[PDB]
Amino acid sequence: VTESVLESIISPVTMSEFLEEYWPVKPLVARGEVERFTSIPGFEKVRTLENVLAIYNNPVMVVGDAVIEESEGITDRFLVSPAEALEWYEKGAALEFDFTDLFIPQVRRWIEKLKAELRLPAGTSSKAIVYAAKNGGGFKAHFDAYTNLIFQIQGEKTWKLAKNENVSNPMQHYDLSEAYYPDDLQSYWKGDPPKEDLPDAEIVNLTPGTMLYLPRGLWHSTKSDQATLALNITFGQPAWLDLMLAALRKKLISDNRFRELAVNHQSLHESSKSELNGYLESLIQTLSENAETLTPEQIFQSQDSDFDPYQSTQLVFRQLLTSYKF
């Protein structure tokens, strides 16, 4: 059958069904034999923890209660060498091998293809990540501003999934162990947080060969009683706001008045403060008039902008680090 890699994996669900009833809002669980994952380019290289370790020349994130206890409560995660990560792994810390696509770079082709098949803006952030855990490790209840296609490779992993009644379309991460909401999030958080154990969540056991589509914003937590290994393909979720502000900035960056250095008005004398306010009024009027002339075509024309400079910077930095042998 002339099928896409994604189609091959979610069969007998069609890609149209996926796009109409699941993406980008509802989770999908697709079960089957792990061998159908072998059409993912580079899968054989990340099929076992020993294989991932043989190729992954980068720092590894470790997360969990052992980190909280060692750090005397300062943090729940460290970035460490692959070797040290194995020491933490034995203490039940979850290991995250981020930007695994640097080390199976053939998957990058596929990811870009999948990004187009999902009709994501070209500029959307995308990567592969490997997650490994044992001894009850994993992640406590949280949500992400990203969506994931999750391919369970080894072991049985317990996911909790709950609808998020507090925020629609979150644009930042949040750990439920913060109960305090960060600034932007505070502006659109509604209602009471869920309990730490997500008591109303759906529990899903992921086994080898299970693919889980995980939409952005769902509350989730993970636990690996025994050793597990999974490969995630992780996508940004650029908002209309992202594209609109990129388009507006493209219209304004040409104007030297907008490129001039900004000034902290705090130290200024009152007359200078007022003059700055009049200068800024001029800018405000011009910004508003450029916003008023914004068109759909211009918004679409900025779909190839960098909407996640945090992810892009982390990719560049990790690429530069490959010159050290971790």
Ligand X SMILES: O=C(O)CNC(=O)C(=O)O
Q: Point out which residues bind Mn ion (CB under 5 A).
A: 144
Q: Name the binder of 222 from Mn ion, ligand X, a second copy, none, CB < 5-8 A by kind.
A: ligand X
Q: Name the binder of 148 from Mn ion, a second copy, ligand X, none, CB < 5-8 A by kind.
A: ligand X
- To the nearest whole angstrom, how small is the minimum distance from the Cβ of residue 167 to a second copy? 9
In this chain, which of 62, 94, 111, 185 binds ligand X, going by CB under 6 A?
Answer: 94
145 is an interface residue for ligand X by CB under 6 A? no
Q: Closest by alpha carbon to 127, among 321, 325, 257, 316?
A: 316
- To the nearest whole angstrom, how small is the minimum distance from the Cβ of residue 54 to ligand X? 21
Report whether 173 belongs to an annotated binding site.
no
Report whether 269 belongs to an annotated binding site.
no
Nearer Cβ to a second copy (31/257):
257
- The three state secondary structure string of 36-88 is HHHHCCCHHHHCCHHHHHHHCCCCEEEECHHHHHHCCCCCCEEEECHHHHHHH
SS3 assignment, position 5: helix
SS3 assignment, position 260: coil
Its sign, for the CA torsion 65, 156, 18, 106, is positive
Nearer Cβ to ligand X (101/305):
101
In this chain, which of 230, 233, 246, 247 binds ligand X, going by CB under 6 A?
Answer: 230
Site string for ligand X, 199-218 (x = CB under 6 A): ---------------x----
- To the nearest whole angstrom, how small is the minimum distance from the Cβ of residue 173 to ligand X? 9
Q: Name the binder of 138 from a second copy, Mn ion, ligand X, none, CB < 5-8 A by kind.
A: ligand X
* DSSP β-bridge partners for residue 175: 142
Q: Closest by alpha carbon to 134, among 33, 218, 69, 230?
A: 230
Q: Which residues contact 79 (CB under 8 A, 6 or more apart)?
A: 59, 60, 61, 62
What is the side-by-side order of every strand in the sheet holding 174-175? 174-175, 142-143, 219-223, 157-162, 202-206
> Are the C-beta atoms of 122 and 49 separated by less than 8 Å?
no
Nearer Cβ to a second copy (101/308):
308
Q: Kindly state the DSSP code that residue 224 receives in the 8-state scheme.
A: B
Q: Closest by alpha carbon to 219, among 205, 202, 237, 236?
A: 202
Whether a cis peptide bond, with omega within 30° of 0, leads into 12 is yes
125 is an interface residue for ligand X by CB under 6 A? no
Nearer Cβ to ligand X (247/315):
315
Nearer Cβ to ligand X (161/246):
161
- To the nearest whole angstrom, how small is the minimum distance from the Cβ of residue 56 to a second copy? 14
Q: Name the binder of 232 from Mn ion, ligand X, a second copy, none, CB < 5-8 A by kind.
A: ligand X
Distance of alpha carbon 148 from the chain centroid: 8
- To the nearest whole angstrom, how small is the minimum distance from the Cβ of residue 317 to ligand X? 19
Query: Where is the binding site for Fe cation, in residues?
Result: 142, 144, 220
Annotated binding-site positions: 142, 144, 220
Q: Which residues bind ligand X (CB under 6 A)?
A: 94, 131, 133, 138-139, 144, 148, 150, 214, 220, 222, 230, 232
